[PDB]
Symmetry: C3
Subunit: 188 residues, 3 copies
């Protein structure tokens, strides 16, 4: 009965902060959503098996054991959903030097079974300027638009394989409060 | 041997009237296409199995049996396909308040086995202007939202093509040029 | 372990010629990639199978066996990968008169198991001027060409979701062809 919701967006789009604010407002109203990050959920599982001590060591792992941890992360999130509604911060695609890599390949969706995929969007201009303010980080607006394109294709495909609705929310400067209200609204 | 064709489009783009026009001129040539609406096939399937008596009572059934109605609906159209070519009027994605919902999830595709996905498009301007004319719109939103829906529909239709092998055909249904779109679809089916 | 790479692009973008330069420079560095054409793997598979003697007969076989040929092509390319890295030149989608046709439908991906899907792109203007120059083009517009680049993206991303292959876009721009090669050599590391 409890919902599984995935929140995605490119670095700098502000989707993590948006979800934290939404859960706070859902809790004023008595609706508990537990927030997790899919990637540290994978890191946690790999430490459980003695596979790592360091988080940089993750992307030096073989493609098989990395496919199994992905599976255990989704199943593990599937387990938390018996005890609370779950909101998962993850990438629709990771922009890697080798190309766009789906954050939820089919073997992860079959275990996770989301009810909603959220795509958090804004203009390339607003995204690139946020990045420059972040003292912890250079790529330009065309590469940012390309990524927001490929993220859309990946989430719609997730929707075709899982049955989740795919919801696009705009997170615009001066209007972050509007993004919260629509996301609260989606989940009620 | 018979073909199963899916025709898709956002509300107001005229794909239904395009389809009915194409079906009528094809029959003049000795080609039978039966036209069905995927949403009414789901209603009919849920009635036979005792699940409902009303077409509104369906969007209050649990998502599990509602997924089974979907699976059976795709199966029923492939059954109709032993007897005629079949054209299915359906949304590539339905734009719901909760987000875009795929009109043919994989479990439907596994039974439907479509041969062609047609995406009927035009400019968001014409779509909004057609919609405003319809006094049967109090639930129809801006052109940027219309452009977004035609985007997601393309991504969903190509995924159907990747998972089924159906070719995905884009037809432009423009004001003053409706007759050209019909003729291009007739050509697609010949 | 050897990697299998799919290289894609609309006609006239130069994805084929980009690959011949890259495989040629990779070997100077001691890295062997074998280049194959997915459609010629299919033709060769069917010739053993008594199904054809002529490429004329291929686009006239029944749709069950021609899916079966598709699958055996994916398997056979996956077999070549036991002995060397394999680079597969194919269409992410084929623009046919009936619409866009995926070049790696799901049943092929399950057998081919690519590691990288590469999309070669440039402006529709550059693509269209190349096409007119080629006297080996036997008519379509810049809008039709961009629509094809759009669907190829939707398909290629779909491959990554189903397989875990990375989807990489390389721009192959006029006056900057040598720049595109360097990016692809880099991809192959
Ligand atoms: Cl995004
Ligand atoms: Cl604000
Ligand atoms: Cl559409
Ligand atoms: Cl309509
Ligand atoms: Cl007209
Ligand atoms: Cl090519
Ligand atoms: Cl070329």
């Amino acid at each position: 009965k409890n919902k599984v919701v995935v929140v995605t967006g490119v670095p700098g789009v502000g989707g993590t902060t948006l979800t934290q604010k939404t859960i706070e407002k859902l809790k004023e109203e008595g609706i508990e959503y537990k927030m997790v990050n899919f990637g540290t959920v994978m890191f946690e599982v790999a430490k459980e098996e003695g596979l790592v001590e360091d988080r940089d060591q993750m992307r030096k792992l073989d493609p098989d054991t990395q496919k199994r941890i992905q599976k255990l992360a989704g199943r593990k999130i599937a387990e938390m959903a018996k005890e609370s509604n779950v909101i998962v911060d993850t990438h629709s695609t990771v922009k890697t030097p080798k190309g766009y890599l789906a954050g939820l390949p089919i073997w992860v969706l079959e275990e996770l079974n989301p009810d909603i995929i959220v795509i958090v969007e804004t203009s390339s201009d607003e995204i690139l300027m946020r990045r420059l303010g972040d003292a912890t980080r250079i790529e330009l607006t065309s590469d940012i638009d390309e990524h927001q394109f490929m993220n859309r294709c990946a989430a719609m495909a997730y929707g075709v394989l899982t049955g989740a609705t795919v919801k696009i929310i705009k997170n615009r400067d001066g209007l972050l409060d509007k993004a919260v209200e629509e996301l609260i609204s989606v989940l009620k």
